[PDB]
């Protein structure tokens, strides 16, 4: 009905290796590493071809972010695992789960945030003195949407590409009902 498919900006994925790593050695022998114990208890590294950032902990846990697609995230995680293997630590690809999906879109018209906050008061939370965007907590699917006056919608919380599309399709009518002028 809407005719516009929201585009996924970010992908947060989690992977495990099952082996203990030496952060000092990884930092010294890695091209792009940032090991600051005072700052954080993990090594921050980044790769360019996928344009992604990975946080690697001493417990063998890796958190990949920045991927624009599920297969791109898979490729980035595989390359990270290969980099660690080349470093020498016993790292094997294991459970890779996407824990967060972020998407964006625009409805191409202004939206009455006060009207939405009054009509749908069980799901919306509008406090314009802190953030200039209404927060809508859709219950099914369980997702959080940020609605702005400029007609831009940000979706976050989905674990799969289906949930975010379903949420946008379910929120489009109530958004259209509250168009300014």
């Amino acid at each position: 009905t809407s005719g516009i498919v929201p585009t996924l900006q970010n992908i947060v994925a989690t992977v495990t290796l099952g082996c203990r790593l030496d952060l000092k050695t990884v930092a010294l022998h890695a091209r792009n590493a940032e090991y600051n114990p005072k700052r954080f208890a993990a090594v921050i590294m980044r790769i360019r071809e996928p344009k992604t950032t990975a946080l690697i902990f001493a417990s063998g846990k890796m958190v990949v972010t920045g991927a624009k697609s599920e297969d791109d995230s898979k490729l980035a995680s595989r390359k990270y695992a290969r980099i660690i293997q080349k470093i020498g630590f016993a790292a094997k690809f294991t459970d890779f789960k996407i824990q967060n999906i972020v998407g964006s879109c625009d409805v191409k018209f202004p939206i009455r945030l006060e009207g939405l906050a009054f009509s749908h008061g069980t799901f919306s939370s509008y406090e314009p003195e802190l953030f200039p965007g209404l927060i809508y907590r859709m219950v099914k699917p369980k997702i959080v949407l940020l609605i702005f006056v400029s007609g831009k919608i940000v979706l976050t919380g989905a674990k799969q590409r289906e949930e975010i599309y379903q949420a946008f399709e379910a929120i489009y009518p109530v958004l259209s009902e509250f168009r300014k002028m």
Binding site: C19, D22, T25, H29, G88, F89, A90
Partner: peptide, 10 residues
Amino acid sequence: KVRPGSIAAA
């Protein structure tokens, strides 16, 4: 045992 004779081993 994690590192077979590698740079990590050194």
